[PDB]
Amino acid sequence: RFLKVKNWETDVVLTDTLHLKSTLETGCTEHICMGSIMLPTKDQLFPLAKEFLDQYYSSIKRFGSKAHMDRLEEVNKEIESTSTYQLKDTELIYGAKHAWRNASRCVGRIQWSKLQVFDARDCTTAHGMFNYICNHVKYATNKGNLRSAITIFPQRTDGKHDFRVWNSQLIRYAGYKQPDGSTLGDPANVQFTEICIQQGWKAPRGRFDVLPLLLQANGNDPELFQIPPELVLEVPIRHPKFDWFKDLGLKWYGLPAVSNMLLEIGGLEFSACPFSGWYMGTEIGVRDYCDNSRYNILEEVAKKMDLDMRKTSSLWKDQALVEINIAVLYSFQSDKVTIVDHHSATESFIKHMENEYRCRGGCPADWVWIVPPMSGSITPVFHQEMLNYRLTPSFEYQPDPWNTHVW
Amino acid sequence: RFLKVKNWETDVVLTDTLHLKSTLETGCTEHICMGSIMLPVRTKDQLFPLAKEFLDQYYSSIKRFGSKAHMDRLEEVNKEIESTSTYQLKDTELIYGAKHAWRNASRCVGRIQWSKLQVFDARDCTTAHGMFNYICNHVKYATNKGNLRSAITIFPQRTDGKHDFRVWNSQLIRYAGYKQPDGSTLGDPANVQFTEICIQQGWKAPRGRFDVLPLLLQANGNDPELFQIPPELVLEVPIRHPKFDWFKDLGLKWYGLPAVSNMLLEIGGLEFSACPFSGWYMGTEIGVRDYCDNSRYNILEEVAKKMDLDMRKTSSLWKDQALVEINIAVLYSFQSDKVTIVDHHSATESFIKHMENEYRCRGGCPADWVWIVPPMSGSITPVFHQEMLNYRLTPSFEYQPDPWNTHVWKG
Numbered sequence: 001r002f003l004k005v006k007n008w009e010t011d012v013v014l015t016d017t018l019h020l021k022s023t024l025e026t027g028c029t030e031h032i033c034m035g036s037i038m039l040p041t042k043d044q045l046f047p048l049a050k051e052f053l054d055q056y057y058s059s060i061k062r063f064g065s066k067a068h069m070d071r072l073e074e075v076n077k078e079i080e081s082t083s084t085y086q087l088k089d090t091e092l093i094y095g096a097k098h099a100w101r102n103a104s105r106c107v108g109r110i111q112w113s114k115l116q117v118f119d120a121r122d123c124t125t126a127h128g129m130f131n132y133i134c135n136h137v138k139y140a141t142n143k144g145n146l147r148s149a150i151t152i153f154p155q156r157t158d159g160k161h162d163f164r165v166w167n168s169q170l171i172r173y174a175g176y177k178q179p180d181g182s183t184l185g186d187p188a189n190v191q192f193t194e195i196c197i198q199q200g201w202k203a204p205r206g207r208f209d210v211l212p213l214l215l216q217a218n219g220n221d222p223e224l225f226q227i228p229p230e231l232v233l234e235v236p237i238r239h240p241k242f243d244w245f246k247d248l249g250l251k252w253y254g255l256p257a258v259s260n261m262l263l264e265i266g267g268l269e270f271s272a273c274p275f276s277g278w279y280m281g282t283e284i285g286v287r288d289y290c291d292n293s294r295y296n297i298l299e300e301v302a303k304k305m306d307l308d309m310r311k312t313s314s315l316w317k318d319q320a321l322v323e324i325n326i327a328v329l330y331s332f333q334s335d336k337v338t339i340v341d342h343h344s345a346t347e348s349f350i351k352h353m354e355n356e357y358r359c360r361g362g363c364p365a366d367w368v369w370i371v372p373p374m375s376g377s378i379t380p381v382f383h384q385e386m387l388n389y390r391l392t393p394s395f396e397y398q399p400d401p402w403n404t405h406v407w
Numbered sequence: 408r409f410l411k412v413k414n415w416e417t418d419v420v421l422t423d424t425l426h427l428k429s430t431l432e433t434g435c436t437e438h439i440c441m442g443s444i445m446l447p448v449r450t451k452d453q454l455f456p457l458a459k460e461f462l463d464q465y466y467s468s469i470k471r472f473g474s475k476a477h478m479d480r481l482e483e484v485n486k487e488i489e490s491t492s493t494y495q496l497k498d499t500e501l502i503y504g505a506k507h508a509w510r511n512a513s514r515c516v517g518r519i520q521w522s523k524l525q526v527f528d529a530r531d532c533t534t535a536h537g538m539f540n541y542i543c544n545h546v547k548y549a550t551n552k553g554n555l556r557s558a559i560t561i562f563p564q565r566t567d568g569k570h571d572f573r574v575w576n577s578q579l580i581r582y583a584g585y586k587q588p589d590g591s592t593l594g595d596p597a598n599v600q601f602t603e604i605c606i607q608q609g610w611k612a613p614r615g616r617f618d619v620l621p622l623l624l625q626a627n628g629n630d631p632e633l634f635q636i637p638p639e640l641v642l643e644v645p646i647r648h649p650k651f652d653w654f655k656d657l658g659l660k661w662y663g664l665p666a667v668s669n670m671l672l673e674i675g676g677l678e679f680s681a682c683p684f685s686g687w688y689m690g691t692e693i694g695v696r697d698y699c700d701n702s703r704y705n706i707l708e709e710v711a712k713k714m715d716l717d718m719r720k721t722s723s724l725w726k727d728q729a730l731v732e733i734n735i736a737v738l739y740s741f742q743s744d745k746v747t748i749v750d751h752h753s754a755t756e757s758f759i760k761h762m763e764n765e766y767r768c769r770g771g772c773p774a775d776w777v778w779i780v781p782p783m784s785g786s787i788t789p790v791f792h793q794e795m796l797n798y799r800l801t802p803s804f805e806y807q808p809d810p811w812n813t814h815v816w817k818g
């Protein structure tokens with residue numbers, strides 16, 4: 001019930017008590033651990049509202065005060081009457097910051113309290129959503145000096161009037177299936193690219209085409225918009241040693257901005273809540289570039305380096321991997337676009353864990369996601385035991401809306 | 408109940424039914440996942456069900472389930488338990504049991520090899536000197552002049568828990584570590600405490616950076632005794648790099664035979680507290696963890712210095728760069744001396760084929776992702792992208808506490 005986590009590199013032991021507030025379920029049982037599985041009414045709503053308002057009022061040292069009680073009373077009256085309620089601005093901001101704070105898969109949470117929250121609950125149309133999103137993108141990008149932000153569209157009502165951003169991120173590259181069987185551009189987005197084409201998009205059919213936004217207001221059929229090219233900051237990828245690297249013609253965008261997730265605050269559901277931070281280098285240079293089902297560039301790079309590609313034991317893949325990641329970091333740094341490397345990010349997260357243990361009694365963390373996809377054991381997170389559990393407010397996966405939308 | 412796992416690179420979906428036969432606990436609940444926690448005297452009472460389950464599995468493996476031979480063996484074990492409180496495995500059941508403990512070991516990426524295991528039955532052993540002889544024979548056999556063969560040696564099972572056989576070493580071959588008065592460590596920091604026990608017990612320490620530890624061996628619950636493995640039986644590989652000629656001058660070497668000697672083998676409810684087993688190395692065990700962990704030999708700085716990488720900012724990835732070079736060197740050195748070793752690409756690829764085969768023929772393959780994924784280049788190996796289900800099957804290998812914490816000294 002009071003659980004210990006040990007760092008095996010430093011012997012530091014931390015005691016977790018926060019897990020006892022865990023509300024949602026993990027997918028694991030005493031018989032089976034699902035740690036590596038990617039996805040494991042009025043009556044319902046009032047406990048959720050209360051649980052949230054209690055933690056909110058406690059956070060501002062006003063637990064058990066009239067202002068606390070009064071707000072419980074008010075929301076209670078409002079649910080009874082309307083079957084939902086509206087968060088105060090102060091609650092919305094707190095809820096959103098805490099959804100990031102509770103995100104067990106996020107290595108970047110030392111930053112959780114510096115989050116700019118844009119309240120878009122007055123939005124009514126896809127054009128309005130487009131406006132709010134462009135403003136988000138420009139604010140967060142800040143000419144390369146990136147700032148964390150989330151834009152929150154109106155909450156779910158009857159569930160037939162959902163706001164959704166159909167894109168998985170605000171900024172991603174198209175993927176095209178070709179005659180010759182191969183894939184041009186990002187194969188992860190092939191399907192979404194086709195949904196764009198079939199909804200009208202005129203695609204340039206290149207390797208790095210910024211996708212248009214496909215926005216759904218109020219349960220209506222979604223609409224297409226091109227983000228002003230001028231608001232999409234990109235980095236050409238070169239290497240500080242290898243002159244030929246630039247010839248590969250690689251680039252990536254500066255703003256990572258997840259747009260397909262659902263924010264839950266005090267029982268309320270915000271199905272459109274695009275949020276953004278900045279990149280850790282490996283996301284681009286290890287996953288985006290080197291996954292076999294992504295840009296899959298290792299072969300071409302290793303070839304340019306003239307490595308012995310005959311045998312897996314020459315570690316040519318590993319060699320090329322490092323260099324590609326050196327180039328990503330170098331290019332963002334040279335163009336002055338905020339980026340963090342995995343050494344620096346994981347060291348920060350260990351510091352954050354210690355802060356959260358001291359100040360909050362724990363920190364939910366998902367080791368499988370927190371350890372970088374390269375050089376795992378040479379980052380301190382590898383040696384750090386983590387307890388994973390679900391706290392609310394939260395971000396949650398939600399199914400892609402084309403599998404749901406009634407047209 | 409059926410459970411599905413998905414590979415996110417290939418979209419291949421597998422269906423696990425094997426998990427229905429698990430009963431030992433995971434550490435996890437519906438409310439907490441303990442998947443990255445390193446660690447999340449039996450009565451007749453509990454023993455006959457454990458024996459019966461085991462013999463049912465053994466008898467099925469041989470297509471003799473429900474046979475007269477199956478039934479007679481159940482009746483024979485049952486009587487033996489009730490009259491002696493324990494029982495003895497037949498040789499065939501010992502072999503099968505040891506093989507399955509390996510097969511069931513969810514942290515082991517090498518399991519494609521599970522059915523090729525040489526089992527040495529040391530249950531007639533009575534003294535520490537006898538244990539020393541068995542262990543030397545196991546080292547020589549497994550080593551096979553560099554052409555490594557997997558093996559396990561199985562000493563007598565636990566009886567009352569006061570008569571335990573234990574190998575006090577964590578591995579049969581490992582290097583000494585010495586804490587110096589100035590706070591630095593000479594040799595392997597992981598073995599400082601065990602090294603100090605060896606010295607205390609009378610070992611004359613050479614005090615260098617790679618001194619092979621003496622064996623410290625407990626038979627029949629007696630005080631453990633020290634033995635030096637004959638050096639001619641300890642195969643070692645000097646580490647050099649195919650391109651960097653100063654790499655040899657770091658003075659690195661490692662032993663070829665990875666042989667775990669501190670775990671507990673459970674078969675049919677019986678407990679074999681000394682059961683050293685050995686395979687061959689995956690390169691990263693040495694090049695990543697042994698050499699480059701901060702709490703081990705910690706050579707990243709010296710290697711990167713010699714490489715003259717930019718060391719003033721982590722974002723040069725000097726650590727990553729030096730890490731790959733060291734690992735190339737380890738694989739090169741082993742291959743050049745004709746000592747079996749596997750790289751992490753080859754090992755993980757084989758593990759995926761093993762795991763798929765297991766799903767088809769066996770209905771599952773319990774696997775601990777946290778351990779299976781190699782400690783460098785994680786996502787360029789196929790296991791990173793493979794969903795896994797972790798659960799506990801018996802027969803099994805289990806952690807047990809270090810014996811110096813529990814041993815009752817005689818003097």
Ligand code: HEM
Pocket residue numbers: 099100103105106107108109111115148149150275276277278279280283340345369395
């Ligand atoms: C400030 C810079 C940030 C860095 C460096 C960072 C780092 C990361 C990394 C490396 C991942 C793993 C995701 C992957 O591999 O695809 C991650 C996941 C996640 N992050 Fe953060 N993050 C940052 C900002 C944020 C912000 C501002 C939020 C919310 C407001 C957030 C919420 C999450 C969530 C919900 C996940 C899991 C996404 C999923 O399940 O696919 N991140 N982040």
Ligand code: HEM
Pocket residue numbers: 505509512514515516517518520524557558559670684685686687688689692749754778804
């Ligand atoms: C044949 C060559 C083998 C290779 C390349 C192999 C590879 C590995 C690796 C990389 C690990 C993770 C251990 C670590 O990082 O410290 C491991 C763990 C394990 N292996 Fe295998 N293995 C092999 C043979 C065997 C054999 C023969 C057995 C037993 C008969 C075995 C049983 C285990 C067990 C019980 C663990 C967990 C260790 C622990 O929890 O500390 N392995 N092995």
Ligand SMILES: Cc1cc(N)nc(COC[C@H]2C[C@H](OCc3cc(C)cc(N)n3)CN2)c1
Pocket residue numbers: 038039256257258275276277278279280283397
């Ligand atoms: C906010 C933020 C900052 C930063 N530096 N990086 C990120 C990356 O998160 C992107 C999101 C999109 C992919 O989604 C994978 C995924 C798939 C599925 C089926 C479920 C799930 N939870 N996650 C991986 N994580 C997000």
Ligand SMILES: Cc1cc(N)nc(COC[C@H]2C[C@H](OCc3cc(C)cc(N)n3)CN2)c1
Pocket residue numbers: 445446517665666667684685686687688689692806
């Ligand atoms: C048989 C074999 C072959 C091969 N190539 N590699 C191995 C490696 O297993 C070595 C063993 C020793 C360390 O054990 C650490 C450890 C500590 C604790 C507290 C528990 C636990 N299960 N394991 C890591 N695994 C074993």
Ligand SMILES: C[C@H](O)[C@H](O)[C@H]1CNc2nc(N)[nH]c(=O)c2N1
Pocket residue numbers: 035036037038368369370415791792793794795
């Ligand atoms: C199957 C496994 O859970 C899956 O590949 C995970 C592993 N760890 C990950 N870690 C991060 N940060 N991002 C990912 O997409 C994944 N994928």
Ligand SMILES: C[C@H](O)[C@H](O)[C@H]1CNc2nc(N)[nH]c(=O)c2N1
Pocket residue numbers: 008382383384385386442443444445777778779
């Ligand atoms: C705390 C964490 O679980 C611990 O560092 C584990 C992680 N994964 C591992 N994986 C392997 N193969 N070996 C290890 O020692 C570890 N250590």
Ligand SMILES: [Zn+2]
Pocket residue numbers: 028029032033034035435439440441442
């Ligand atoms: Zn679990």
